[PDB]
């Protein structure tokens, strides 16, 4: 949802929602930094 509204043209997602995604993906999901790099590549590949 958040990567879909704050999307601009698709995969171009800025750096405030990467780490806002992190504290919710660290809070709701409890994830790291580098596994988070893989899940953000999957999030922009899905968002692509």
């Amino acid at each position: 949802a958040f990567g879909h509204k704050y999307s601009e043209e698709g995969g171009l997602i800025n750096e405030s929602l990467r780490d806002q995604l992190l504290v919710t993906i660290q809070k709701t999901f409890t994830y790291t930094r580098t596994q988070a790099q893989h899940l953000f590549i999957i999030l922009m590949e899905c968002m692509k």
Partner: peptide, 22 residues
Amino acid sequence: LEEVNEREHSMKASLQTVDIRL
């Protein structure tokens, strides 16, 4: 009330990011 809800959602996300900044 709908304005208050959307704005409070934005404020809560900013507060969680502020906690991340600490």
